[PDB]
Amino acid sequence: HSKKQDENIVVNKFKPKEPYVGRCLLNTKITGDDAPGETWHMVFSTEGEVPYREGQSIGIVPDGIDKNGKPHKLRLYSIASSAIGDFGDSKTVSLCVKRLVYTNDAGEVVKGVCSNFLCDLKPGSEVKITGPVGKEMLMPKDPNATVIMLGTGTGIAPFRSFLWKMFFEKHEDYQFNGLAWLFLGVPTSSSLLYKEEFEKMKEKAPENFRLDFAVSREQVNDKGEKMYIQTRMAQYAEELWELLKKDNTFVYMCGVKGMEKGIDDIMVSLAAKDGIDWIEYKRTLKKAEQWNVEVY
């Protein structure tokens, strides 16, 4: 009855207390040295035992006794690789991890537990993997659907997963001949994630893939305003709106919890011009599986 690729979905094969123990193959900082906060791309071995699809997540159990004397609870991460993985052997999973480092209003430099465990992982070391988890951020069954994707920072992950299966891979029962559109919002150029891969896709399928970046510190619009994901979206407002009125249009949103706000601000302008209340309409879209959000 569903409109998304949930044919034989596997959810929760591995549990938090009995997780799959994998090993780190690769792990690379994919952001410039001058960027605000480092992000790492890491590839894990699964020997094919974690049957995830595009847009799912895996939980990681970080090594260590916690500040009470018991094992850490898991932390969820969107799967940054495709079903068949970065190597295409269907034996790997990949993650897009921001190293959480902040300084608290008590003066101390605080390092987030799991993200630092992940960004400090060496090839060969063991990683505890759970899941996979998720059903909300699955690809649309329809290979001719309009797939609008909006991400900020590590929130790019499920879209990288999406797009790899769309343009980088050949599949018998899937031949993408729709329109895929990515809006990726970051602060600096050095904070761009996977730009190279996306660029390659654009010139490989100019008819089927559209790519807009939004670099808030370095870019500006006609009113001289900072380029956030919605500021860039605004530039195609009337066009984006038109696609949303179509029943084969699937929107996905992923990243910082705050991102959801500005987009709505832009969507009010749009829908009001056509006499519709956006918040009211969003509900129709959600229940029709067309507006899809996973923010954190």
Ligand X SMILES: Cc1cc2nc3c(=O)[nH]c(=O)nc-3n(C[C@H](O)[C@H](O)[C@H](O)COP(=O)(O)OP(=O)(O)OC[C@H]3O[C@@H](n4cnc5c(N)ncnc54)[C@H](O)[C@@H]3O)c2cc1C
Least Å from the CB of residue 80 to ligand X: 7
Q: Which of 30, 148, 149, 157 binds ligand X (CB under 6 A)?
A: 157
Residue 113 within binding range of ligand X, rule CB under 6 A: yes
Size, binding site for ligand X by CB under 6 A: 20
Toward ligand X, which CB reaches closer, 140 or 255?
A: 255
Element (H, E) at 240: helix 237-244
Q: Which of 112, 143, 210, 281 binds ligand X (CB under 6 A)?
A: 112
Catalytic status, residue 281 = no
Q: Please choose, out of 17-25, 99-107, 162-170, 181-189, the segment that lies near ligand X by the rule CB under 6 A.
A: 99-107
Catalytic status, residue 254 = yes
Toward ligand X, which CB reaches closer, 98 or 232?
A: 98
Residue 8 within binding range of ligand X, rule CB under 6 A: no
Least Å from the CB of residue 114 to ligand X: 3
What is the distance between the alpha carbons of residues 57 and 133, in angstroms, rounded to a whole number? 5
Pairing of strands 126-133, 109-111: unpaired
What is the distance between the alpha carbons of residues 92 and 22, in angstroms, rounded to a whole number? 9
Of the candidates 181, 146, 160, 152, the one whose C-alpha atom is nearest the C-alpha of residue 263 is: 152
Residue 114 within binding range of ligand X, rule CB under 6 A: yes
How many residues are given for the chain?
Answer: 296
The whole-angstrom distance between residue 155's C-alpha and the CA centroid of its chain comes to 4
Residues 31-90 binding ligand X (CB under 6 A) are 57, 75-78
Residue 96 within binding range of ligand X, rule CB under 6 A: yes
Phi, psi of 143 (to 5 degrees): -75, -5
Q: What is the DSSP string of 64-102?
A: SB-TTSSBPPPEEEEB-S-TT-SSSSS-EEEEEEE--EE
Of the candidates 58, 32, 35, 36, the one whose C-alpha atom is nearest the C-alpha of residue 46 is: 58
Residue 293 within binding range of ligand X, rule CB under 6 A: no
Residue 294 within binding range of ligand X, rule CB under 6 A: yes
Query: Annotated catalytic residue: which of 20, 54, 194, 294?
Result: 294
Tokens of 267: 């969507």
Tokens of 30: 């994919």
Least Å from the CB of residue 51 to ligand X: 19
Catalytic status, residue 294 = yes
What is the distance between the alpha carbons of residues 210 and 216, in angstroms, rounded to a whole number? 20
Catalytic status, residue 119 = no
Residue 101 within binding range of ligand X, rule CB under 6 A: no
Provide the annotated active-site residues.
Answer: 77-78, 254, 294, 296
Q: Which residues of this chain interact with ligand X, rule CB under 6 A?
A: 57, 75-78, 96-98, 100, 102, 104, 112-116, 154, 157, 294, 296
